[PDB]
Design a protein around this motif. Structure first.
Motif, PDB file in Angstrom:
ATOM      1  N   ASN A 237      51.638  49.270  34.163  1.00 33.01           N
ATOM      2  CA  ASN A 237      51.549  48.251  35.255  1.00 33.01           C
ATOM      3  C   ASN A 237      50.182  47.956  35.723  1.00 33.01           C
ATOM      4  N   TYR A 238      49.369  49.013  35.075  1.00 39.07           N
ATOM      5  CA  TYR A 238      47.671  48.810  35.445  1.00 39.07           C
ATOM      6  C   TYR A 238      47.152  48.227  34.328  1.00 39.07           C
ATOM      7  N   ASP A 239      47.545  48.571  33.110  1.00 43.21           N
ATOM      8  CA  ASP A 239      46.983  47.908  31.837  1.00 43.21           C
ATOM      9  C   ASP A 239      47.424  46.509  31.735  1.00 43.21           C
ATOM     10  N   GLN A 240      48.696  46.300  32.400  1.00 41.93           N
ATOM     11  CA  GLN A 240      49.227  44.834  32.257  1.00 41.93           C
ATOM     12  C   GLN A 240      48.313  43.958  32.962  1.00 41.93           C
ATOM     13  N   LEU A 241      47.859  44.196  34.237  1.00 37.62           N
ATOM     14  CA  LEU A 241      46.754  43.436  34.915  1.00 37.62           C
ATOM     15  C   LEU A 241      45.688  43.222  33.908  1.00 37.62           C
ATOM     16  N   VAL A 242      45.212  44.066  33.088  1.00 37.23           N
ATOM     17  CA  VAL A 242      43.870  44.261  32.469  1.00 37.23           C
ATOM     18  C   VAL A 242      44.215  43.215  31.089  1.00 37.23           C
ATOM     19  N   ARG A 243      45.341  43.306  30.472  1.00 37.71           N
ATOM     20  CA  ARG A 243      45.582  42.360  29.391  1.00 37.71           C
ATOM     21  C   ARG A 243      45.649  40.799  30.042  1.00 37.71           C
ATOM     22  N   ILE A 244      46.036  40.459  31.219  1.00 39.11           N
ATOM     23  CA  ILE A 244      46.172  39.413  31.882  1.00 39.11           C
ATOM     24  C   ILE A 244      44.571  38.951  31.897  1.00 39.11           C
ATOM     25  N   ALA A 245      43.953  39.978  32.509  1.00 43.61           N
ATOM     26  CA  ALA A 245      42.418  39.745  32.985  1.00 43.61           C
ATOM     27  C   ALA A 245      41.534  39.307  31.773  1.00 43.61           C
ATOM     28  N   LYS A 246      42.041  39.723  30.718  1.00 47.14           N
ATOM     29  CA  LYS A 246      41.251  39.549  29.352  1.00 47.14           C
ATOM     30  C   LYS A 246      41.501  38.215  28.643  1.00 47.14           C
ATOM     31  N   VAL A 247      42.535  37.343  29.577  1.00 48.48           N
ATOM     32  CA  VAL A 247      42.793  36.090  29.050  1.00 48.48           C
ATOM     33  C   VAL A 247      42.056  35.067  30.017  1.00 48.48           C
ATOM     34  N   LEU A 248      42.638  35.354  31.385  1.00 49.10           N
ATOM     35  CA  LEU A 248      42.106  34.551  32.506  1.00 49.10           C
ATOM     36  C   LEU A 248      40.887  34.920  33.129  1.00 49.10           C
ATOM     37  N   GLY A 249      40.309  35.929  32.576  1.00 49.69           N
ATOM     38  CA  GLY A 249      39.174  36.461  33.253  1.00 49.69           C
ATOM     39  C   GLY A 249      39.215  37.090  34.542  1.00 49.69           C
ATOM     40  N   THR A 250      38.075  37.852  34.641  1.00 44.39           N
ATOM     41  CA  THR A 250      38.139  38.736  35.816  1.00 44.39           C
ATOM     42  C   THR A 250      37.600  38.118  37.216  1.00 44.39           C
ATOM     43  N   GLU A 251      36.873  36.919  36.821  1.00 46.01           N
ATOM     44  CA  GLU A 251      36.221  36.230  38.023  1.00 46.01           C
ATOM     45  C   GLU A 251      36.899  35.641  38.887  1.00 46.01           C
ATOM     46  N   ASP A 252      38.236  35.077  38.294  1.00 47.17           N
ATOM     47  CA  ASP A 252      39.178  34.295  38.929  1.00 47.17           C
ATOM     48  C   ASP A 252      40.167  35.254  39.510  1.00 47.17           C
ATOM     49  N   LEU A 253      40.112  36.273  39.218  1.00 48.02           N
ATOM     50  CA  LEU A 253      40.950  37.601  39.493  1.00 48.02           C
ATOM     51  C   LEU A 253      40.365  38.112  40.934  1.00 48.02           C
TER      52      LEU A 253
END
Ligand SMILES: NCCCCn1cc(CCn2nc3c(Br)c(Br)c(Br)c(Br)c3n2)nn1
Length: 328
Positions: A237-253
């Motif tokens: 679940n933690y790595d899952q959010l990272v995979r999402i962050a590598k596409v949508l970016g961390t700034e919008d996160l």
């Protein structure tokens, strides 16, 4: 401080003006049927909550599917039952044929309409661009219905979508994790499969709504048009959010969690890092380009967003140019 509350931008007060009998599943009275009418043919598979069998209704010689539930909370069982009955007859919603007592398991058994289904393993290798748009639209009809009926699925995934490719029939199944939406209510973030969990679940935000299903739907669409199943493939679940962050970016996160005043898990400090937002053309190549269109990318982009409030609703999604090609 405290997290900022949220409301569904659509179908917010649907259950507030329904009679109590509609959403109060804890007080529901199960109308039991005769278990003798059904004979188990073969075992289709075992879940974490039940065993699924293929059977025959010997009263009308019709083929059915039996879902023998494993011992779980009685409140949870009545929830699935009440939801299935409320959504019975809806577009592409699986039909609860009967409810019976299994003499062996001593637990309720749910009888559903049969669907000549092909597994999505071989099926997703045979779907054309048109087929994808068609089935996405059929699912949207199902999601829009249950959302309008004030019901939240919370487990949208290819496994929970039965398809009879021959007669082009689609059925959304497995409403065991489904819930009624009440404005201001906190829910369990531990729902749906990992690869289809929305960011709200991953950052532990509980006041979510129907838009959770739209993210899951987006994950499916992305896997189909990019030929990458699953699109977001985390090992936890933690790595899952990272995979999402590598596409949508961390700034919008951070904008997302700052807006709702959400504090991120401190363990993300050593694993998240910094990532720019990627363009969707990045994932396009010669092996999937025939499934990709400008309308597809724009539609997907409007589905996969951190902010659950900025996601397309089911109704809005059906209005998108992506489905202009679909025959109605
Ligand atoms: N706890 C999860 C329950 C499902 C487990 N499971 C089932 C299968 C076989 C594939 N399958 N499942 C179906 C269901 Br549930 C219905 Br309702 C219908 Br209709 C059809 Br057709 C199904 N086919 N593997 N794991």
């Amino acid at each position: 401080s405290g997290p900022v509350p949220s409301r569904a931008r659509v179908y917010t007060d649907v259950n507030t003006h329904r009679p109590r009998e509609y959403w109060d599943y804890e007080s529901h009275v199960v109308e039991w049927g005769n278990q003798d009418d059904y004979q188990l043919v073969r075992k289709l598979g075992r879940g974490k909550y039940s065993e699924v069998f293929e059977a025959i209704n010997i009263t009308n010689n019709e083929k059915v599917v039996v879902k023998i539930l494993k011992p779980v909370k009685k409140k949870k069982i009545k929830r699935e039952i009440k939801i299935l009955e409320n959504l019975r007859g809806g577009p592409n919603i699986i039909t609860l044929a009967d409810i019976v007592k299994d003499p062996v398991s001593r637990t309720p058994a749910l009888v559903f309409e049969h669907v000549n289904n092909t597994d999505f393993k071989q099926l997703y290798q045979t779907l054309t661009d048109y087929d994808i748009r068609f089935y996405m639209y059929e699912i949207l009809k199902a999601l829009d219905y249950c959302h309008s009926m004030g019901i939240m699925h919370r487990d949208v995934k290819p496994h929970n979508v039965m398809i009879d490719h021959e007669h082009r029939k689609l059925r959304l199944i497995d409403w065991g994790l489904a819930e009624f939406y009440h404005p201001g209510q906190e829910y369990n973030v531990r729902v749906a499969s990992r690869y289809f969990k929305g960011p709200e679940l991953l950052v532990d935000y509980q006041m979510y709504d129907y838009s959770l299903d739209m993210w899951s739907l987006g994950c499916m669409l992305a896997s189909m048009i990019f030929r990458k199943e699953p699109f977001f493939h985390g090992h936890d679940n933690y790595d899952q959010l990272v995979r999402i962050a590598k596409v949508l970016g961390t700034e919008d996160l951070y904008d997302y969690i700052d807006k709702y005043n959400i504090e991120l898990d401190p363990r993300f400090n050593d694993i998240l890092g910094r990532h720019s937002r990627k363009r969707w053309e990045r994932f396009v190549h010669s092996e999937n380009q025939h499934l990709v269109s400008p309308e597809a990318l724009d539609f997907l982009d409007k589905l996969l967003r951190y902010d659950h409030q900025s996601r397309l609703t089911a109704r809005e999604a059906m209005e998108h140019p992506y489905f202009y090609t679909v025959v109605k």
